[PDB]
């Protein structure tokens, strides 16, 4: 897993303000947004983090906070590794006395 995505900021907040939501720590990484075909923006956008070391710290700090928009909510690209090997069955099982 790597990077984060913000999913509740409205089109009133945009890339150069989105930067400051994380650049307030006295450093900068990188971020972006993807406009609709009418040119109207989203607020909802992608953040490329400093490193995974500070991502997990920032994830608990800014999820539920608000800056130039709504309450903001934060997600990540996650991973897939769980498999399926035949982990369940559909047959009876018991032991009764008999001679």
Tab-separated table of C-alpha atoms in Angstrom:
chain	number	residue	atom	x	y	z
A	1	UNK	CA	0.000	0.000	0.000
A	2	UNK	CA	1.042	3.630	-0.782
A	3	UNK	CA	-0.390	7.216	-1.305
A	4	UNK	CA	-3.777	8.678	-0.096
A	5	UNK	CA	-6.965	9.994	-1.785
A	6	UNK	CA	-9.402	12.596	-0.291
A	7	UNK	CA	-13.111	11.996	-1.042
A	8	UNK	CA	-15.408	14.719	0.523
A	9	UNK	CA	-13.726	18.132	-0.167
A	10	UNK	CA	-15.974	20.070	-2.709
A	11	UNK	CA	-14.864	21.942	-5.895
A	12	UNK	CA	-14.442	25.185	-3.801
A	13	UNK	CA	-11.048	23.673	-2.619
A	14	UNK	CA	-8.405	22.895	-5.322
A	15	UNK	CA	-4.757	21.665	-5.856
A	16	UNK	CA	-2.825	24.692	-4.429
A	17	UNK	CA	-5.029	24.656	-1.253
A	18	UNK	CA	-4.990	20.778	-1.133
A	19	UNK	CA	-1.157	21.065	-0.881
A	20	UNK	CA	-1.449	23.257	2.300
A	21	UNK	CA	-3.675	20.584	4.052
A	22	UNK	CA	-0.380	18.552	4.351
A	23	UNK	CA	2.300	21.304	3.724
A	24	UNK	CA	1.300	22.936	7.097
A	25	UNK	CA	3.917	20.524	8.660
A	26	UNK	CA	6.708	22.873	7.266
A	27	UNK	CA	7.629	20.629	4.250
A	28	UNK	CA	5.984	19.545	0.889
A	29	UNK	CA	5.371	16.324	-1.123
A	30	UNK	CA	2.977	16.318	-4.195
A	31	UNK	CA	-0.797	16.159	-5.088
A	32	UNK	CA	-3.405	16.524	-7.919
A	33	UNK	CA	-7.138	16.771	-8.929
A	34	UNK	CA	-9.135	15.687	-12.037
A	35	UNK	CA	-11.659	18.155	-13.539
A	36	UNK	CA	-14.970	17.205	-15.214
A	37	UNK	CA	-15.265	17.941	-19.009
A	38	UNK	CA	-17.212	21.208	-18.272
A	39	UNK	CA	-14.023	22.506	-16.458
A	40	UNK	CA	-15.664	22.682	-12.968
A	41	UNK	CA	-13.287	20.624	-10.659
A	42	UNK	CA	-14.022	18.167	-7.762
A	43	UNK	CA	-12.058	18.870	-4.506
A	44	UNK	CA	-11.986	15.054	-4.306
A	45	UNK	CA	-8.367	14.261	-5.393
A	46	UNK	CA	-5.037	12.369	-4.943
A	47	UNK	CA	-2.106	13.018	-2.529
A	48	UNK	CA	1.379	11.503	-3.049
A	49	UNK	CA	2.774	11.281	0.501
A	50	UNK	CA	6.110	12.326	2.086
A	51	UNK	CA	6.700	8.609	3.006
A	52	UNK	CA	4.668	5.738	4.632
A	53	UNK	CA	6.297	6.760	7.993
A	54	UNK	CA	4.279	10.036	8.095
A	55	UNK	CA	1.230	8.827	6.056
A	56	UNK	CA	-0.011	6.658	8.984
A	57	UNK	CA	0.506	9.661	11.383
A	58	UNK	CA	-1.378	12.086	9.042
A	59	UNK	CA	-4.201	9.513	8.379
A	60	UNK	CA	-5.399	9.835	12.031
A	61	UNK	CA	-4.841	13.672	12.093
A	62	UNK	CA	-6.755	14.912	8.981
A	63	UNK	CA	-9.525	12.263	8.551
A	64	UNK	CA	-12.489	14.087	10.240
A	65	UNK	CA	-10.890	17.614	9.943
A	66	UNK	CA	-12.154	20.525	7.686
A	67	UNK	CA	-10.203	23.121	5.544
A	68	UNK	CA	-11.785	25.471	2.895
A	69	UNK	CA	-14.519	22.826	2.168
A	70	UNK	CA	-16.458	20.078	4.029
A	71	UNK	CA	-15.358	17.591	6.703
A	72	UNK	CA	-12.639	15.642	4.808
A	73	UNK	CA	-12.280	11.833	4.620
A	74	UNK	CA	-9.100	9.933	3.624
A	75	UNK	CA	-8.553	6.549	1.859
A	76	UNK	CA	-5.509	4.662	0.353
A	77	UNK	CA	-4.700	2.180	-2.513
A	78	UNK	CA	-4.513	-0.781	0.002
A	79	UNK	CA	-3.397	-4.335	-1.178
A	80	UNK	CA	-4.659	-7.886	-2.159
A	81	UNK	CA	-3.106	-11.121	-0.765
A	82	UNK	CA	-5.892	-13.107	1.010
A	83	UNK	CA	-6.231	-16.137	-1.422
A	84	UNK	CA	-8.939	-18.943	-1.468
A	85	UNK	CA	-7.809	-22.627	-1.231
A	86	UNK	CA	-11.062	-24.535	-0.385
A	87	UNK	CA	-11.668	-22.952	3.060
A	88	UNK	CA	-15.269	-24.285	3.629
A	89	UNK	CA	-17.393	-27.482	3.169
A	90	UNK	CA	-21.058	-28.652	2.785
A	91	UNK	CA	-21.154	-32.158	4.427
A	92	UNK	CA	-22.438	-33.545	7.825
A	93	UNK	CA	-20.216	-34.731	10.740
A	94	UNK	CA	-21.070	-36.764	13.913
A	95	UNK	CA	-20.074	-39.795	16.081
A	96	UNK	CA	-22.725	-42.134	17.641
A	97	UNK	CA	-22.305	-45.366	19.756
A	98	UNK	CA	-22.802	-48.640	17.768
A	99	UNK	CA	-21.844	-52.384	18.000
